[PDB]
Design an enzyme around this catalytic site. Structure first.
Site, short mmCIF file in Angstrom:
data_model
loop_
_atom_site.label_atom_id
_atom_site.label_comp_id
_atom_site.label_asym_id
_atom_site.label_seq_id
_atom_site.Cartn_x
_atom_site.Cartn_y
_atom_site.Cartn_z
N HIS A 95 0.80 -1.19 -0.02
CA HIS A 95 -0.09 -0.03 -0.04
C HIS A 95 0.80 1.23 0.05
O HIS A 95 0.21 2.27 0.09
CB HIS A 95 -1.12 -0.17 1.19
CG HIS A 95 -0.31 0.29 2.59
ND1 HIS A 95 0.30 1.23 3.09
CD2 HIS A 95 -0.26 -0.71 3.51
CE1 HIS A 95 0.65 1.09 4.15
NE2 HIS A 95 0.46 -0.03 4.69
N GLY B 55 3.53 5.89 9.96
CA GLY B 55 4.59 5.94 9.62
C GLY B 55 5.49 4.47 10.01
O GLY B 55 6.61 4.39 9.61
N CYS C 167 4.39 1.47 9.45
CA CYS C 167 4.40 0.24 8.65
C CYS C 167 5.64 -0.24 8.02
O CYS C 167 6.29 0.74 7.54
CB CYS C 167 3.29 0.88 7.56
SG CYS C 167 1.71 1.03 8.02
C1 LIG Z 1 1.34 2.66 8.12
O1 LIG Z 1 2.25 2.27 8.63
C2 LIG Z 1 1.47 4.03 7.22
N1 LIG Z 1 2.65 4.68 7.25
C3 LIG Z 1 2.56 5.93 6.70
C4 LIG Z 1 1.62 5.98 5.79
BR1 LIG Z 1 1.82 7.78 4.53
C5 LIG Z 1 0.50 5.51 5.51
C6 LIG Z 1 0.58 4.10 6.29
O2 LIG Z 1 -0.65 3.04 6.07
C7 LIG Z 1 -1.86 3.90 6.43
C8 LIG Z 1 -2.82 2.58 6.55
C9 LIG Z 1 -3.60 2.44 7.52
C10 LIG Z 1 -4.55 1.50 7.67
C11 LIG Z 1 -4.73 0.72 6.43
CL1 LIG Z 1 -5.97 -0.80 6.30
C12 LIG Z 1 -4.05 0.69 5.28
N2 LIG Z 1 -3.95 -0.11 4.25
O3 LIG Z 1 -4.88 0.27 3.00
O4 LIG Z 1 -3.51 -0.91 3.87
C13 LIG Z 1 -3.12 1.93 5.47
#
Ligand SMILES: *C(=O)c1ncc(Br)cc1OCc1ccc(Cl)c([N+](=O)[O-])c1
Ligand SMILES: *C(=O)c1ncc(Br)cc1OCc1ccc(Cl)c([N+](=O)[O-])c1
Lengths: 299, 298
Positions: free
Chosen positions: B41, B141, B143
C-alpha cells in the site's frame, strides 16, 4: 496507537560486548576504543566474603586476563582499577565503537539493559533506577558486565553496569566509572524502602489519556495536598520541576498537572476497583515523561 | 533472578531497515540480498486506500517511481507477492544476516523493531493473539516494521500493515499473506473474539515458581477435560495434549506436574495478590520463552 514498555535498539551496544576471563571467572565486558570495562570482582569464591581487592589485583598480571571479542582474542597491555570496575587496556581499538558518553542517572530515570552471557547478547529490556537505587531486572549468574544505556540520537549514554544479585532478588551495579548506585559494595546488604516514582506514574496517566483510556479522569488539588497523600502511599514527593517536566504532556492533553494529580490522589485512596489502565491493573512508574513523549511522537 | 518481557537483540535487523518512498507515501522496508520488502500500500494515494485495485495501481508505476533510502539505492525491478512489494535493487545488503521467512502460529511470541523513516525507534516483545492481531505500539509511519525471532539466524515472521480503529494492529508474513481475516483496505474490519493463550499463562506460572512466587500452588489435581470446562467459561483457549507436552521440560525443572499447574490455574480463574509483580495473568510468554530467559540462552 498502543503503548508498550519499549527498549532502545541495541545494535550499537551489541558491537561493544566482549567476554573477560580471569582464572575460572568469566563475565561480560564493554569494549570502547582500546579499553575494556568490566566488574572488578572478576578477579575466588573464598574472596567473595571479604576481598581486599587492591591486594588481589596486585597478584595479577596482564596475561592473566583473557578478553575475547567473538572469535578474535584481544591482548591486554595494561590493567587498572577505578572504584569497582576493572579497566583493561588492549592493543586494538574497537572498530564498532559508537559515539558514547558515561553518565550517572538519577533515581526514577529509565534505561535499556542488554543482558549478556559469555560476551554474547541474549535479550534487551527497559527498566528504571528505583528510588532506593536498585533495579528489578532479569539477571542470571554470568550476566555481570551487562550494561544499561540510553540512546540520545546516534550517541550512546552508558549509565549502568551489572554487579550483583541481592538476596531480595533485585539487582545492584555501578556507573561506568565504578561508583555503585546506592549503599552497595557477599554479605547481608539491605536496600532502602522502595517508593513509587510519582512523576513517572503521572506521565503514564498522560499516555493513557492520549491512547483513549480516560475513565480515571475526575476534582483539583494543590501541590501540597497531593504530596501529603503521596507520602502516605509511599510515593515520591512531587516537586515543581516535576510539574515543569510534565508541561508538554499537559499542553498536548489539555489536562492541567494538578488536575491529573487529583485523579491520581483518587486512584490511590480508592484503588482501581478492578478496572485496568493501558492493560495494567497496577499503577506503572517506569515510564519517564520523556519516555511517553518519545513513544507517542515516534522519535 | 527476575523475569522481564525480553526482546531479542535487534542489531541484525537494524542493518536491514531502509526507507521506501513512492510519490508522497513513505514507510519502512526490509533490505535482504538484492530485494527490498515493504507493504504494497506504499503505492496508494489517500483516495485509493478506500478501494484500491492494487494490480491496476502497480501497473501505472515504474521502477523510478520508487525512492529507496538506506541511511544516506537504484531500483531495477518491482513485483507484487500477495500484499508485499518486492523491489529488486542493484546492491545486495552487505549486512544481510542469515535469515528465513516463517509464518508463526497464534500464541507464539516475537520481537518488533518499531521504525519510522527507515530508522529504528524501539524494540519490544509481543505475541500473535488468537484472533491474529497484535497489541503493539505503532504510530502512522511505522508500517514496514518487522517482527522476528532469532534462533545467528533471524526468522522474520511479521510485517506491520495497518492500525485498526480498535487500537490493535495487523500485518502479514514476509510472503505477503495477512494474519487473520484482514485486507489492506481502509474499511471497517472486525477482528475475532480474542482469547487468552492458556499454554502461555501456564508457562508464566512456572517462571513464577522458578523465581520464588509459589503462593498459587495447590494440592488439587484435574484432567485435561475438566480444566477445559473451566477455561472455556473464562475465555481461555482450550489446552490440548500437545500443550501439555510442550510444558514437559518446565514440569521436570520445577517438579510440578502439568495437570497440577492446571489445577492451580483453576483457582486463579475461579477466585481471582500479585504474581511476578503483575496483578493480571500474563499470556505472552511461551514455554520456550520462559526456558530461554531462565536458562540464559544467548
Ligand atoms: C502505516 O504504517 C502507514 N504509514 C505511513 C503512511 Br503515509 C501510510 C500508512 O498506512 C496507512 C494505512 C492505514 C490503514 C490501512 Cl488498512 C492501510 N492499508 O490500506 O493498508 C494503510
Ligand atoms: C555476576 O554477574 C557473576 N557472574 C559470573 C560469576 Br563466575 C560471578 C558473578 O558474580 C557473582 C557475585 C554475586 C554477588 C556479589 Cl555481591 C558479587 N560481588 O562480590 O561483587 C559477585
Amino acid at each position: 496507537s498502543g503503548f508498550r514498555k519499549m527498549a532502545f535498539p541495541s545494535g550499537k551496544v551489541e558491537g561493544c560486548m566482549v567476554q573477560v576471563t580471569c582464572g575460572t571467572t568469566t563475565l561480560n565486558g564493554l569494549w570502547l576504543d582500546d579499553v575494556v570495562y568490566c566488574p572488578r570482582h572478576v578477579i575466588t569464591s573464598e574472596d567473595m566474603l571479604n576481598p581486599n581487592y587492591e591486594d588481589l589485583l596486585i597478584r595479577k598480571s596482564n596475561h592473566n586476563f583473557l578478553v575475547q571479542a567473538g572469535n578474535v582474542q584481544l591482548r591486554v597491555i595494561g590493567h587498572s582499577m577505578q572504584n569497582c570496575v576493572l579497566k583493561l587496556k588492549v592493543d586494538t581499538a574497537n572498530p564498532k565503537t559508537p559515539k558514547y558518553k558515561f553518565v550517572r542517572i538519577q533515581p526514577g530515570q529509565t534505561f535499556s539493559v542488554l543482558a549478556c552471557y559469555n560476551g554474547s547478547p541474549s535479550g534487551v529490556y527497559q527498566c528504571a533506577m528505583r528510588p532506593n537505587f536498585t533495579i528489578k531486572g532479569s539477571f542470571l549468574n554470568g550476566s555481570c558486565g551487562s550494561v544499561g544505556f540510553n540512546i540520545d540520537y546516534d550517541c550512546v549514554s552508558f549509565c549502568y553496569m551489572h554487579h550483583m544479585e541481592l538476596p531480595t532478588g533485585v539487582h545492584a551495579g555501578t556507573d561506568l566509572e565504578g561508583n555503585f548506585y546506592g549503599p552497595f559494595v557477599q554479605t547481608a546488604q539491605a536496600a532502602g524502602t522502595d517508593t513509587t516514582i510519582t512523576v513517572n506514574v503521572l506521565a503514564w496517566l498522560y499516555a493513557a489519556v492520549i491512547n483513549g483510556d480516560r475513565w480515571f479522569l475526575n476534582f483539583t488539588t494543590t501541590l501540597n495536598d497531593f504530596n501529603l497523600v503521596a507520602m502516605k502511599y509511599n510515593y515520591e514527593p512531587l516537586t515543581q520541576d516535576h510539574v515543569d517536566i510534565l508541561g508538554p504532556l499537559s499542553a498536548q492533553t489539555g489536562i492541567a498537572v494538578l488536575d491529573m494529580c487529583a485523579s491520581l490522589k483518587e486512584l490511590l485512596q480508592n484503588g482501581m476497583n478492578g478496572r485496568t489502565i493501558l492493560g495494567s491493573a497496577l499503577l506503572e512508574d517506569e515510564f519517564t515523561p520523556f519516555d511517553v513523549v518519545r513513544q507517542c511522537s515516534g522519535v
